[PDB]
Coordinates of C-alpha atoms in Angstrom, one line a residue:
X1 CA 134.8 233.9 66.1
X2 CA 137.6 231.1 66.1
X3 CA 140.5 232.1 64.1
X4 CA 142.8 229.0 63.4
X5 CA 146.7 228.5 63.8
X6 CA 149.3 228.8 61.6
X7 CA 150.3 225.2 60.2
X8 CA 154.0 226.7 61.8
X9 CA 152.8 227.5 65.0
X10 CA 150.9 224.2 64.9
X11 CA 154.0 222.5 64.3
X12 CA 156.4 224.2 66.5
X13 CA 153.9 223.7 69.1
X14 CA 153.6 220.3 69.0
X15 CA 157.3 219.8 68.7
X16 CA 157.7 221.8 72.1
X17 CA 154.4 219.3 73.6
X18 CA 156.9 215.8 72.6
X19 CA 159.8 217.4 74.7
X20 CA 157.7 219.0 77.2
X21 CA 155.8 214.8 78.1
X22 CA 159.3 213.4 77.6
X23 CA 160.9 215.4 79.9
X24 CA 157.8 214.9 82.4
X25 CA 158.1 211.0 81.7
X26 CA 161.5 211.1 81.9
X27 CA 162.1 209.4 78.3
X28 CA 164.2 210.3 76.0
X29 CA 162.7 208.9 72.9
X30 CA 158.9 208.7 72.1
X31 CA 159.2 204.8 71.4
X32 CA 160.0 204.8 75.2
X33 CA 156.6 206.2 76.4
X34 CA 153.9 204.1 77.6
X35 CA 150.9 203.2 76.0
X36 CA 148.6 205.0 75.1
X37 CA 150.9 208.2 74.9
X38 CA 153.3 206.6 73.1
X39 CA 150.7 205.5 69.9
X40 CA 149.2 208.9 70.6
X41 CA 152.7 210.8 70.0
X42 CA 153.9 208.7 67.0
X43 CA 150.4 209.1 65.4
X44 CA 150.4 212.8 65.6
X45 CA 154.4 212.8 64.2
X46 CA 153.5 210.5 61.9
X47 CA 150.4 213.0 60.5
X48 CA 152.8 215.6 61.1
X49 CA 155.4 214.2 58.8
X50 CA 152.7 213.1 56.0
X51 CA 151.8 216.8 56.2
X52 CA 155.2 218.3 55.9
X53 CA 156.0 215.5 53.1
X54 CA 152.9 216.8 50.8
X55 CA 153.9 220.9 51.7
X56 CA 157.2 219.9 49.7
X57 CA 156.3 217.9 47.2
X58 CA 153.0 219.6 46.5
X59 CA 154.2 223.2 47.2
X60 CA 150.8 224.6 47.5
X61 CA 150.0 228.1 47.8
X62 CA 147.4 227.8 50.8
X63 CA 148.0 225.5 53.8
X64 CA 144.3 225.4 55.2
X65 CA 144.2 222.4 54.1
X66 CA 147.0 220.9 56.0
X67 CA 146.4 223.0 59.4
X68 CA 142.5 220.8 58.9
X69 CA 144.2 217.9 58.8
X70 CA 146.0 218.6 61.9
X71 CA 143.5 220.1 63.9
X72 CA 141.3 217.2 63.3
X73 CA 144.3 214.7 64.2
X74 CA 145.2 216.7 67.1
X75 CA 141.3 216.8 68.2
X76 CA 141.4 212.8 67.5
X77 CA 144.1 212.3 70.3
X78 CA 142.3 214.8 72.7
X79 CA 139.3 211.8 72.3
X80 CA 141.4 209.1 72.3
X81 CA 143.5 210.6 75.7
X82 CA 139.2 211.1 76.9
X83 CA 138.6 207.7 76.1
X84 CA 141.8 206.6 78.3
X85 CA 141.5 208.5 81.2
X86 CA 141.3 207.2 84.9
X87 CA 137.8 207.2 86.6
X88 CA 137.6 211.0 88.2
X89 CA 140.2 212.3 86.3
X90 CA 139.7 215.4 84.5
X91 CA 140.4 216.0 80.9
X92 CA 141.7 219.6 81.5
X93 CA 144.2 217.8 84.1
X94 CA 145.9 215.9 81.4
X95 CA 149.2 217.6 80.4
X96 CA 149.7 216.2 76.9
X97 CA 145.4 216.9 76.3
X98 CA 146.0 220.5 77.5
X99 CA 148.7 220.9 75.3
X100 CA 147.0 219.9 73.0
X101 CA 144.1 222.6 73.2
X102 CA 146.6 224.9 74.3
X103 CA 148.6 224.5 70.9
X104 CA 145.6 224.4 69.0
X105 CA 144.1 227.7 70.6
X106 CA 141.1 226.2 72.0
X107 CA 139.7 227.2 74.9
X108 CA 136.3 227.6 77.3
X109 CA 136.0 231.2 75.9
X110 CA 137.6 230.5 72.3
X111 CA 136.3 227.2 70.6
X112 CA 135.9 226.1 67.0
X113 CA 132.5 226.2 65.4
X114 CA 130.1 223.1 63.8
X115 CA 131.3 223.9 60.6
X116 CA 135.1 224.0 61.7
X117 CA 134.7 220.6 63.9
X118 CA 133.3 218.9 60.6
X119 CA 136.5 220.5 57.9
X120 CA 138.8 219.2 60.7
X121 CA 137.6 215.8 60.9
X122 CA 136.4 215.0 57.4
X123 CA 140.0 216.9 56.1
X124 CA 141.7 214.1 58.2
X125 CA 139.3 211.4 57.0
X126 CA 140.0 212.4 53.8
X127 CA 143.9 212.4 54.9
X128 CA 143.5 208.7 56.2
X129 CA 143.1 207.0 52.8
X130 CA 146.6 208.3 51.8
X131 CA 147.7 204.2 53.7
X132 CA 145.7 202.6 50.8
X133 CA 146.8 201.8 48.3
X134 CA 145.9 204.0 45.2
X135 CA 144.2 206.0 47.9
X136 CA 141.1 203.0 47.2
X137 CA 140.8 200.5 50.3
X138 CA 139.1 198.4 47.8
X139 CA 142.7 197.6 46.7
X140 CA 143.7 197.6 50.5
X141 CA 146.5 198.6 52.7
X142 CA 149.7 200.5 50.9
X143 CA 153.2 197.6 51.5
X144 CA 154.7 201.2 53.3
X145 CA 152.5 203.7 54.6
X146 CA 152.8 207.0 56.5
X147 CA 150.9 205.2 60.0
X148 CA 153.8 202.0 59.4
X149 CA 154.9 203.3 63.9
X150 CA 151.6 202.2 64.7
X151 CA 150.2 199.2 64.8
X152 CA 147.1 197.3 62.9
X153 CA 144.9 197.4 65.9
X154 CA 145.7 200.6 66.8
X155 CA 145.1 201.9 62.7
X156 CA 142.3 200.6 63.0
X157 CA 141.2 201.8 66.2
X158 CA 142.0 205.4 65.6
X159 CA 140.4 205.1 62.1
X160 CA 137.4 203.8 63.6
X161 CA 137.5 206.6 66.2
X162 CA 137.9 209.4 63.7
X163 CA 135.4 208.3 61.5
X164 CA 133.0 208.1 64.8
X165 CA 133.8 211.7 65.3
X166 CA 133.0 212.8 61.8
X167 CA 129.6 211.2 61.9
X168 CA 129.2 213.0 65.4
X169 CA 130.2 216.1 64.3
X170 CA 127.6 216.2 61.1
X171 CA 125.1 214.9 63.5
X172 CA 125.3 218.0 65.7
X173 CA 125.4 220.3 63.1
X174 CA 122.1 218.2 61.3
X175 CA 120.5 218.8 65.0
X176 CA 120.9 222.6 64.8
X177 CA 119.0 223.2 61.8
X178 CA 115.8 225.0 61.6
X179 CA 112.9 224.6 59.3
X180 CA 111.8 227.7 58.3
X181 CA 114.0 228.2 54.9
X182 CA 111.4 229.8 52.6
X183 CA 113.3 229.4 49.2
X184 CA 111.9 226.7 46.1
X185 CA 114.3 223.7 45.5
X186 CA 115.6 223.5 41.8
X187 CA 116.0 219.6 41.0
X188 CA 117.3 220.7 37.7
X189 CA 120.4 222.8 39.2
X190 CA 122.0 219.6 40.7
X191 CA 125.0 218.2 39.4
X192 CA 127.2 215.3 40.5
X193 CA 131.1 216.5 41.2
X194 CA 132.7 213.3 39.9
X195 CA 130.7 211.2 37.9
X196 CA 130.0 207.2 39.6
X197 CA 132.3 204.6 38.7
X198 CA 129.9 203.4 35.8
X199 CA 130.6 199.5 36.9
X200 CA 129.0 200.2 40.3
X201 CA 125.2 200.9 38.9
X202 CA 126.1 198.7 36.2
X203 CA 124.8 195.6 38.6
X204 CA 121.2 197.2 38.7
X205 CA 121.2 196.7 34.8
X206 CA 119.3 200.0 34.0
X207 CA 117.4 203.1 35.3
X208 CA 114.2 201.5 34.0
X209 CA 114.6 198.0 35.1
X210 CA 115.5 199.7 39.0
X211 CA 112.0 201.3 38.4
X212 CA 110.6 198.5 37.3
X213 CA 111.7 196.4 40.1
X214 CA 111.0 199.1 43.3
X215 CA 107.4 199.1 41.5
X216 CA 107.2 195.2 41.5
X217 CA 108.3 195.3 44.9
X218 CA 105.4 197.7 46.0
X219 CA 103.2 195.6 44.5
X220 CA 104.5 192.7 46.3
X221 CA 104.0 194.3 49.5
X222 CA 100.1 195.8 49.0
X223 CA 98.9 192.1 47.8
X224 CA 101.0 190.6 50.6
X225 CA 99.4 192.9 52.9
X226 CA 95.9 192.9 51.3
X227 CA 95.9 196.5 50.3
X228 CA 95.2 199.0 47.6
X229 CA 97.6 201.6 48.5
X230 CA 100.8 202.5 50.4
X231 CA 98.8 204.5 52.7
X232 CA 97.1 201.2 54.1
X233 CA 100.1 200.3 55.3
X234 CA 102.1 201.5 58.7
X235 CA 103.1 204.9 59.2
X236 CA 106.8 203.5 59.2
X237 CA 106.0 201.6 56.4
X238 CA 104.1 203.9 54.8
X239 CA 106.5 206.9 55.0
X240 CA 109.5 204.7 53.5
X241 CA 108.4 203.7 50.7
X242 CA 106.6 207.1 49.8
X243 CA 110.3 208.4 50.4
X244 CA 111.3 205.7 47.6
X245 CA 108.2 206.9 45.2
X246 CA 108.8 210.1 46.0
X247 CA 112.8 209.8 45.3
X248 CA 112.2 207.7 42.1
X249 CA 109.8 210.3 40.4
X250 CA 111.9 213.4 41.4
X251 CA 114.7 212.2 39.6
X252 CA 113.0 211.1 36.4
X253 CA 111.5 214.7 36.3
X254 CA 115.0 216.0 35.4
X255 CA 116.8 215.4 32.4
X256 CA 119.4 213.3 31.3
X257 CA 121.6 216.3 30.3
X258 CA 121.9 217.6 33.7
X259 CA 121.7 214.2 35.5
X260 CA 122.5 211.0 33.7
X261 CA 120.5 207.7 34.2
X262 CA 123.8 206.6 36.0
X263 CA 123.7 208.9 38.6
X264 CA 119.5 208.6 39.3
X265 CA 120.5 204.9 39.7
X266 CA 122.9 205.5 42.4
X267 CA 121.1 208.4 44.0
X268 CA 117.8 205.7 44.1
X269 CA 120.2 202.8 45.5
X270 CA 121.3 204.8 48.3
X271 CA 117.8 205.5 49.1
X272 CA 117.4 202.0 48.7
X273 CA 120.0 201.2 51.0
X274 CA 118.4 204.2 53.9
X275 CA 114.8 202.4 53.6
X276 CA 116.6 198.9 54.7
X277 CA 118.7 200.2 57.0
X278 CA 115.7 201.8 59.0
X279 CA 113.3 198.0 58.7
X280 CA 116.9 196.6 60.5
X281 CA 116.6 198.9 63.0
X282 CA 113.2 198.2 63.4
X283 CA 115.0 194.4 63.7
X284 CA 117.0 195.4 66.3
X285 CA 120.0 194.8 63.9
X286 CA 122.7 197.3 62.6
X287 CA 121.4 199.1 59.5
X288 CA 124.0 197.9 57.0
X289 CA 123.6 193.8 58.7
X290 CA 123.3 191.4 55.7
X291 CA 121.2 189.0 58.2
X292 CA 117.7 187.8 56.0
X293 CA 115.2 189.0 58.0
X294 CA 112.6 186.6 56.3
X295 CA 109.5 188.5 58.1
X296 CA 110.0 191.9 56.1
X297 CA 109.3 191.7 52.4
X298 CA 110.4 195.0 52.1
X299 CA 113.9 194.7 53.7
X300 CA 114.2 192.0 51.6
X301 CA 112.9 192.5 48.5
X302 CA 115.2 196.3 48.7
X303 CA 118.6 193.3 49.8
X304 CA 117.8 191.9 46.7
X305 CA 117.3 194.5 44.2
X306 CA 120.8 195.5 45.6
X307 CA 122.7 193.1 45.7
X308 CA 123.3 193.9 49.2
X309 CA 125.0 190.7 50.6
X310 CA 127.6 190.5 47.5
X311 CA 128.4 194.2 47.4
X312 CA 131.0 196.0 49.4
X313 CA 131.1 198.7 51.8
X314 CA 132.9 200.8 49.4
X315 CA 130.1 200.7 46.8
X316 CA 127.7 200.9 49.6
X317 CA 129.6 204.2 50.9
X318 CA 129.1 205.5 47.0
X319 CA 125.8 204.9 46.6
X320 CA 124.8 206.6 50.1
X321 CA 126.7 209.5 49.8
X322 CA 125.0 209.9 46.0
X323 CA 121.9 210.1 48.0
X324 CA 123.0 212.0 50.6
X325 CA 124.2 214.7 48.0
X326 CA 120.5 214.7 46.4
X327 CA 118.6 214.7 49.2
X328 CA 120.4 217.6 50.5
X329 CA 120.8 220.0 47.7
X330 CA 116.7 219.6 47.6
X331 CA 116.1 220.2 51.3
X332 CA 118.5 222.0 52.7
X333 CA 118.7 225.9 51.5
X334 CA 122.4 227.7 51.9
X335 CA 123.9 230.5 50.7
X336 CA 124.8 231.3 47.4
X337 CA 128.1 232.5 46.0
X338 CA 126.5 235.3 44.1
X339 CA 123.7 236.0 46.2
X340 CA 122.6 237.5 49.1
X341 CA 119.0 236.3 49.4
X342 CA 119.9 233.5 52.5
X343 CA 121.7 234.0 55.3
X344 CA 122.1 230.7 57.2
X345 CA 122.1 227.3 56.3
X346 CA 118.1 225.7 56.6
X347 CA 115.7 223.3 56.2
X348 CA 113.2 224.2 53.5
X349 CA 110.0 224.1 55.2
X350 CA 108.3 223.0 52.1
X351 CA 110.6 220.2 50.1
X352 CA 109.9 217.0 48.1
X353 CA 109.2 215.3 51.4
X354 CA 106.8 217.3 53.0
X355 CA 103.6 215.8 52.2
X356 CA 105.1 212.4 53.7
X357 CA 103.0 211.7 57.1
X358 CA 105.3 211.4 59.8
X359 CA 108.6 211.7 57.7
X360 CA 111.5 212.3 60.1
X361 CA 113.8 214.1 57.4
X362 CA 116.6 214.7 60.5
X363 CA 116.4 211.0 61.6
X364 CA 117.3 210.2 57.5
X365 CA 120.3 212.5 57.5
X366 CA 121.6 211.1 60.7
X367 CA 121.2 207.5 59.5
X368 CA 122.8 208.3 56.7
X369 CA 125.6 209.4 58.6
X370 CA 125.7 206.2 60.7
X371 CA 125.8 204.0 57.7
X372 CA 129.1 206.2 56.0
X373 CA 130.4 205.4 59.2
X374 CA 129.7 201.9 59.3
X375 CA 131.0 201.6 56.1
X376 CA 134.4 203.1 56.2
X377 CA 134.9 201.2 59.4
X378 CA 134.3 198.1 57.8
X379 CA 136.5 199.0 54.7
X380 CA 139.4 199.8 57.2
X381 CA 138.6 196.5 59.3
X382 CA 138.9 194.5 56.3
X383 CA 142.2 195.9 55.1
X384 CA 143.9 195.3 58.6
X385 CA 142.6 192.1 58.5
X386 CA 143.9 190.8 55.0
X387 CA 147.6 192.5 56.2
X388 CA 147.2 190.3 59.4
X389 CA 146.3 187.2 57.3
X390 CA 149.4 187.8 55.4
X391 CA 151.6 188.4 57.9
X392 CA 150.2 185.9 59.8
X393 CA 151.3 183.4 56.7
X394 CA 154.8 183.6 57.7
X395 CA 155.1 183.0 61.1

């Protein structure tokens, strides 16, 4: 089983890998390198630095968190070197990507498991938002930040990259699930970590009135389609807004003391924001695009009710992840701290979803995935962009 570095090995390792390809390049100064080994270096010194900045002025008393952050940094340039290399050449012919592995301890016979891959990269995603400002890219880009070497394409490019290699990550793992776990969800055992930022749902008005108008919307749909029930219409169709029903009531079943109206109105608008992503795709159009598409009511009706066009990714991330949270503590069985009673982490082979026809619980999660991505890509594309406009207004 994969035993990680010390953060000190880590870093004397990587220290000995910038004079090892300057030596081979015959450089003397990182700066000097060509691209891309020269963003490459200066992005992993400038993560290294970060890191070593918080050990001192944090002084924690573990560094796992730290040696995540540069595993998943270090695994980033691995892709990005992958991503740059010459037709026919080999990864494992790459001296700064062997050194790399080699530093990290990674090998054919000794390699980090799901569950590792995903602490690496969401530790450094996590990481990442240390350039914002207020650690919130709602308030954008930080006047001096750690990643200042680099540049704003290649922020965003590496950003976009790591995020990419999160959402792969969690997808693997989602595709190595089993559905045999035999225990009974406990909707009333749920409970939100940090409570929403109360002005997000506050646009939906009320846990009633979002109710009230997902049920107006169904009933738009079954006279539109001339139809009694939702289960006259497609199996697609059909299946998504069953998820919705099915969603809504779940959540009013449990009570306000254990989850507030708040969070069942964020938990629904991510669910919400899942159903219209998938009528997109059905579009042929990214799952977060705020195109009309005048020929589904239900795409549109769900646009409207969320205010999808005027909101930003951010609250878009917030309300998906909400939903993401639910939907897995009720499906997915995992071990418990003082139990013994599971062993691995499973798919409940009965959960709220099971009497859905057709539901492709899998396909949700990985959507779900997508969309995160999408939208921390987007928050990081619009915060290089305002820089760029501002810079830009001095030249």
């Amino acid at each position: 089983t994969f035993v990680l570095k010390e953060f000190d090995a880590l870093k004397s390792h990587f220290n000995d890998t910038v004079k090892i390809i300057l030596q081979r390049e015959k450089k003397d100064k990182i700066e000097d390198l060509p691209n891309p080994r020269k963003e490459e270096l200066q992005f992993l010194t400038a993560v290294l630095n970060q890191l070593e900045a918080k050990i001192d002025e944090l002084k924690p008393r573990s560094l796992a968190s730290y040696v995540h952050v540069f595993y998943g940094a270090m695994l980033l340039v691995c892709k990005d070197v992958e991503n740059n290399l010459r037709v026919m050449e080999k990864k494992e012919n790459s001296l700064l990507f062997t050194r790399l592995m080699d530093g990290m301890g990674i090998s054919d016979e000794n390699i980090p498991t799901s569950e590792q891959n995903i602490m690496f990269y969401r530790g450094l995603n996590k990481f990442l938002n240390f350039i914002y400002e207020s650690n919130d890219s709602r308030k954008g880009l930080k006047k001096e930040h750690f990643l200042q070497v680099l540049s704003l394409k290649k922020i965003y490019s590496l950003a976009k990259l790591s995020y990419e290699q999160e959402e792969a990550a969690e997808n693997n793992a989602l595709a190595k699930l089993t559905a045999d776990g035999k225990t009974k969800a406990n909707a009333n055992s749920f409970h939100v970590e940090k409570p929403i930022d109360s002005s997000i749902v506050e646009q939906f008005k009320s846990w009633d009135e979002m109710k009230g108008a997902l049920h107006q919307l169904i009933l738009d749909e079954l006279s539109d389609k001339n139809v009694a029930k939702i289960s006259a219409l497609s199996q697609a169709r059909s299946a998504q807004l069953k998820f919705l029903q099915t969603m809504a009531e779940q959540l009013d079943k449990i009570p306000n003391q254990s989850l507030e109206p708040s969070e069942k109105m964020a938990i629904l608008a991510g669910a919400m924001y899942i159903v219209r992503g998938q009528i997109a795709q059905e579009y042929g159009k990214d799952p977060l695009s705020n195109d009309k598409i005048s020929a589904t009511v239900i795409h549109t009706g769900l646009s409207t009710i969320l205010h999808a066009n005027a909101d930003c990714c951010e609250d878009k991330e917030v309300l998906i992840a909400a939903a993401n949270k639910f939907i897995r503590h009720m499906v997915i069985e995992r071990p418990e701290q003082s139990n013994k009673k599971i062993t691995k982490e499973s798919v409940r082979e009965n959960n709220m979803f099971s009497d859905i026809a057709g539901f492709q619980l899998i396909s949700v999660l990985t959507l779900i995935q997508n969309m995160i991505k999408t939208c921390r890509t987007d928050a990081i594309e619009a915060c290089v962009t305002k820089r760029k406009e501002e810079l830009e207004a001095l030249k």
